[PDB]
Design an enzyme around this catalytic site. Sequence first.
Site, PDB file in Angstrom:
ATOM      1  N   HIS A  85       0.866  -1.197   0.000  1.00 21.88           N
ATOM      2  CA  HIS A  85       0.000   0.000   0.000  1.00 21.88           C
ATOM      3  C   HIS A  85       0.902   1.247   0.000  1.00 21.88           C
ATOM      4  O   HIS A  85       1.261   1.805   1.041  1.00 21.88           O
ATOM      5  CB  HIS A  85      -0.970  -0.058   1.172  1.00 21.88           C
ATOM      6  CG  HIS A  85      -2.029   1.020   1.174  1.00 21.88           C
ATOM      7  ND1 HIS A  85      -3.326   0.775   1.586  1.00 21.88           N
ATOM      8  CD2 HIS A  85      -1.969   2.354   0.904  1.00 21.88           C
ATOM      9  CE1 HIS A  85      -4.026   1.903   1.547  1.00 21.88           C
ATOM     10  NE2 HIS A  85      -3.226   2.881   1.148  1.00 21.88           N
ATOM     11  N   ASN A 136       2.239   9.223  -5.965  1.00 27.26           N
ATOM     12  CA  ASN A 136       2.467  10.654  -5.734  1.00 27.26           C
ATOM     13  C   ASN A 136       2.508  11.020  -4.250  1.00 27.26           C
ATOM     14  O   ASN A 136       2.728  12.189  -3.919  1.00 27.26           O
ATOM     15  CB  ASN A 136       1.418  11.492  -6.465  1.00 27.26           C
ATOM     16  CG  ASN A 136       1.695  11.579  -7.981  1.00 27.26           C
ATOM     17  OD1 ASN A 136       2.431  12.457  -8.428  1.00 27.26           O
ATOM     18  ND2 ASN A 136       1.139  10.649  -8.759  1.00 27.26           N
ATOM     19  N   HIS A 177      -0.261  17.352  -7.143  1.00 28.11           N
ATOM     20  CA  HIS A 177      -0.665  17.026  -8.502  1.00 28.11           C
ATOM     21  C   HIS A 177      -0.457  18.196  -9.445  1.00 28.11           C
ATOM     22  O   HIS A 177      -0.247  17.990 -10.649  1.00 28.11           O
ATOM     23  CB  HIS A 177      -2.126  16.597  -8.531  1.00 28.11           C
ATOM     24  CG  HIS A 177      -2.343  15.231  -7.968  1.00 28.11           C
ATOM     25  ND1 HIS A 177      -3.541  14.834  -7.414  1.00 28.11           N
ATOM     26  CD2 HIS A 177      -1.506  14.169  -7.868  1.00 28.11           C
ATOM     27  CE1 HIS A 177      -3.438  13.581  -7.004  1.00 28.11           C
ATOM     28  NE2 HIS A 177      -2.217  13.149  -7.275  1.00 28.11           N
ATOM     29  N   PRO A 180      -4.611   7.085 -12.385  1.00 26.18           N
ATOM     30  CA  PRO A 180      -4.277   7.603 -13.727  1.00 26.18           C
ATOM     31  C   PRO A 180      -5.015   8.919 -13.916  1.00 26.18           C
ATOM     32  O   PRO A 180      -6.177   9.052 -13.499  1.00 26.18           O
ATOM     33  CB  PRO A 180      -4.784   6.526 -14.693  1.00 26.18           C
ATOM     34  CG  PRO A 180      -5.136   5.320 -13.813  1.00 26.18           C
ATOM     35  CD  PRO A 180      -5.429   5.853 -12.435  1.00 26.18           C
ATOM     36  N   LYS A 181      -4.336   9.880 -14.552  1.00 24.69           N
ATOM     37  CA  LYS A 181      -4.799  11.264 -14.653  1.00 24.69           C
ATOM     38  C   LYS A 181      -5.110  11.623 -16.091  1.00 24.69           C
ATOM     39  O   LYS A 181      -4.422  11.184 -17.019  1.00 24.69           O
ATOM     40  CB  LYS A 181      -3.755  12.282 -14.158  1.00 24.69           C
ATOM     41  CG  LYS A 181      -3.153  12.043 -12.755  1.00 24.69           C
ATOM     42  CD  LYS A 181      -4.183  12.074 -11.696  1.00 24.69           C
ATOM     43  CE  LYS A 181      -3.537  11.965 -10.280  1.00 24.69           C
ATOM     44  NZ  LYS A 181      -2.294  11.081 -10.170  1.00 24.69           N
ATOM     45  N   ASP A 215     -10.382   7.268  -7.936  1.00 16.99           N
ATOM     46  CA  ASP A 215     -10.486   8.331  -6.943  1.00 16.99           C
ATOM     47  C   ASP A 215     -11.963   8.562  -6.645  1.00 16.99           C
ATOM     48  O   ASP A 215     -12.792   8.549  -7.558  1.00 16.99           O
ATOM     49  CB  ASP A 215      -9.818   9.592  -7.498  1.00 16.99           C
ATOM     50  CG  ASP A 215      -9.772  10.775  -6.509  1.00 16.99           C
ATOM     51  OD1 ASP A 215      -8.660  11.273  -6.259  1.00 16.99           O
ATOM     52  OD2 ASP A 215     -10.818  11.267  -6.036  1.00 16.99           O
ATOM     53  N   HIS A 264      -9.707   1.255   0.181  1.00 18.34           N
ATOM     54  CA  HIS A 264      -9.623   2.090   1.379  1.00 18.34           C
ATOM     55  C   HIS A 264     -10.959   2.020   2.122  1.00 18.34           C
ATOM     56  O   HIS A 264     -11.995   2.368   1.550  1.00 18.34           O
ATOM     57  CB  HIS A 264      -9.312   3.551   1.000  1.00 18.34           C
ATOM     58  CG  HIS A 264      -7.860   3.783   0.709  1.00 18.34           C
ATOM     59  ND1 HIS A 264      -7.224   3.215  -0.389  1.00 18.34           N
ATOM     60  CD2 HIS A 264      -6.918   4.527   1.350  1.00 18.34           C
ATOM     61  CE1 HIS A 264      -5.957   3.604  -0.405  1.00 18.34           C
ATOM     62  NE2 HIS A 264      -5.751   4.432   0.604  1.00 18.34           N
ATOM     63  N   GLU A 304     -11.808   4.770   6.690  1.00 20.00           N
ATOM     64  CA  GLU A 304     -10.880   5.856   7.044  1.00 20.00           C
ATOM     65  C   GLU A 304     -11.560   6.939   7.872  1.00 20.00           C
ATOM     66  O   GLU A 304     -10.883   7.669   8.602  1.00 20.00           O
ATOM     67  CB  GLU A 304     -10.290   6.520   5.797  1.00 20.00           C
ATOM     68  CG  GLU A 304      -9.420   5.643   4.937  1.00 20.00           C
ATOM     69  CD  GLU A 304      -8.805   6.498   3.802  1.00 20.00           C
ATOM     70  OE1 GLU A 304      -7.638   6.917   3.946  1.00 20.00           O
ATOM     71  OE2 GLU A 304      -9.508   6.773   2.821  1.00 20.00           O
ATOM     72  N   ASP A 314       2.062   6.677   2.260  1.00 15.56           N
ATOM     73  CA  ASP A 314       2.612   7.826   1.548  1.00 15.56           C
ATOM     74  C   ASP A 314       3.935   8.158   2.238  1.00 15.56           C
ATOM     75  O   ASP A 314       3.985   9.027   3.096  1.00 15.56           O
ATOM     76  CB  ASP A 314       1.693   9.050   1.583  1.00 15.56           C
ATOM     77  CG  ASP A 314       0.338   8.782   0.983  1.00 15.56           C
ATOM     78  OD1 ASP A 314       0.249   8.799  -0.240  1.00 15.56           O
ATOM     79  OD2 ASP A 314      -0.652   8.582   1.744  1.00 15.56           O
TER      80      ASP A 314
HETATM   81  O1  LIG Z   1      -4.609   8.637   3.179  1.00 20.59           O
HETATM   82  C1  LIG Z   1      -5.128   8.367   2.068  1.00 20.59           C
HETATM   83  N1  LIG Z   1      -6.498   8.121   1.994  1.00 20.59           N
HETATM   84  C2  LIG Z   1      -7.171   8.067   0.798  1.00 20.59           C
HETATM   85  N2  LIG Z   1      -6.481   8.288  -0.373  1.00 20.59           N
HETATM   86  C3  LIG Z   1      -5.140   8.519  -0.327  1.00 20.59           C
HETATM   87  C4  LIG Z   1      -4.435   8.559   0.868  1.00 20.59           C
HETATM   88  N3  LIG Z   1      -3.132   8.801   0.571  1.00 20.59           N
HETATM   89  C5  LIG Z   1      -2.990   8.930  -0.779  1.00 20.59           C
HETATM   90  N4  LIG Z   1      -4.239   8.737  -1.325  1.00 20.59           N
HETATM   91  C6  LIG Z   1      -4.625   8.812  -2.734  1.00 20.59           C
HETATM   92  O2  LIG Z   1      -3.444   8.743  -3.512  1.00 20.59           O
HETATM   93  C7  LIG Z   1      -3.355   9.915  -4.384  1.00 20.59           C
HETATM   94  C8  LIG Z   1      -1.908  10.296  -4.565  1.00 20.59           C
HETATM   95  O3  LIG Z   1      -1.204   9.327  -5.341  1.00 20.59           O
HETATM   96  P1  LIG Z   1      -1.524   9.185  -6.893  1.00 20.59           P
HETATM   97  O4  LIG Z   1      -2.698   8.267  -7.105  1.00 20.59           O
HETATM   98  O5  LIG Z   1      -0.275   8.555  -7.459  1.00 20.59           O
HETATM   99  O6  LIG Z   1      -1.946  10.529  -7.480  1.00 20.59           O
HETATM  100  C9  LIG Z   1      -4.204  10.977  -3.694  1.00 20.59           C
HETATM  101  O7  LIG Z   1      -4.691  11.950  -4.616  1.00 20.59           O
HETATM  102  C10 LIG Z   1      -5.308  10.171  -2.997  1.00 20.59           C
HETATM  103  O8  LIG Z   1      -6.438   9.999  -3.837  1.00 20.59           O
HETATM  104 ZN   LIG Z   2      -3.725   5.008   1.158  1.00 18.02          ZN
END
Ligand SMILES: O=c1[nH]cnc2c1ncn2[C@@H]1O[C@H](COP(=O)(O)O)[C@@H](O)[C@H]1O
Ligand SMILES: [Zn+2]
Length: 340
Positions: free
Chosen positions: A14, A18, A66, A100-101, A146, A203, A206, A282
């Site tokens: 996990h 980013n 981002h 993915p963006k 997301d 997730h 939370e 993270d």
């Molecule tokens: O603590 C968390 N809870 C829920 N989502 C998270 C958490 N940490 C990172 N993310 C998700 O991971 C993204 C960052 O990594 P990315 O998907 O590579 O852009 C964020 O924009 C969140 O949607």
């Molecule tokens: Zn997470």
Amino acid sequence: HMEWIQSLPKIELHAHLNGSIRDSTLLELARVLGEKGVIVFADVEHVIQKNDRSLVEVFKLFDLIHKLTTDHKTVTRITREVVEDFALENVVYLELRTTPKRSDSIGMSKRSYMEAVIQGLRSVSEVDIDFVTRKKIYVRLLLSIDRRETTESAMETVKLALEMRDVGVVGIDLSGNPLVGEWSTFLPALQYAKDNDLHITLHCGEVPNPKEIQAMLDFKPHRIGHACFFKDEDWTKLKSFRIPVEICLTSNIVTKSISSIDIHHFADLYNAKHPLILCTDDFGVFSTSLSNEYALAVRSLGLSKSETFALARAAIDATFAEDEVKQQLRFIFDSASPEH
Ligand SMILES: O=c1[nH]cnc2c1ncn2[C@@H]1O[C@H](COP(=O)(O)O)[C@@H](O)[C@H]1O
Ligand SMILES: [Zn+2]
């Protein structure tokens, strides 16, 4: 002790791409974008250093990250750096998750974003990597949905993941702000992924949300992340379904999802012999590493070396990897078992 933990072979299940960026890289990108005028460096560096990373507040930080990182060459760079950092602390298997963006002004699609992630994996040179189908690291990928997205957009992500099974995509994550969106928006896309034999991690819990927690458990994903606000009926169902929990100690304590490590539910799960896997979540945002997470857990549970090794090795059967990879991991851990 931290030395023996650092050399322990470890499995990361996990870690958001980013959320795992080096401070030096984030600030370099900030400086460059400032000198171009896209943003004001003092303000951005200030939100980087000041953000308290409470839950509500972490998601502000991600919107800023981002803006710094959503470009193909940067996606490639941070993918390589994240894999290197994990490999350097003897992670031998990494499931990396990323959202993915889409960004029309730079011709970025979800697919081209992911092609840039693959390019990052191909660019890894400091360590040996296996990602398709000297430290060596196996990498596989989770595409994240997301919670801001529509059902249609979530389906686009699932379709992309199925197309990319040849370059190591093994599953789907649901993540993003837990106060946004409804399970009913994402269930149909996740069900399509599951029926196409993708593995699913969610997730879950939370924030307090009893109906959603129950609906996610009834879906029977293959793993869940966090479970911070589960109630007794939720734990009962989780233990009987045997869904492994990705445990993120620092993330949970820093966001104040869990008030302290001494009450964290990972101790109850460990003593119940329920499967759990220590993860970073993270490691950039939260200034940690997987070794540090293991160190916190070893101290709080008072584990011996052999108990710690056994816990680390137990994660193999929670991976989403093909059986051949799990057998290689069993060989890596069996080969390391007598030194622990
Ligand atoms: O603590 C968390 N809870 C829920 N989502 C998270 C958490 N940490 C990172 N993310 C998700 O991971 C993204 C960052 O990594 P990315 O998907 O590579 O852009 C964020 O924009 C969140 O949607
Ligand atoms: Zn997470």
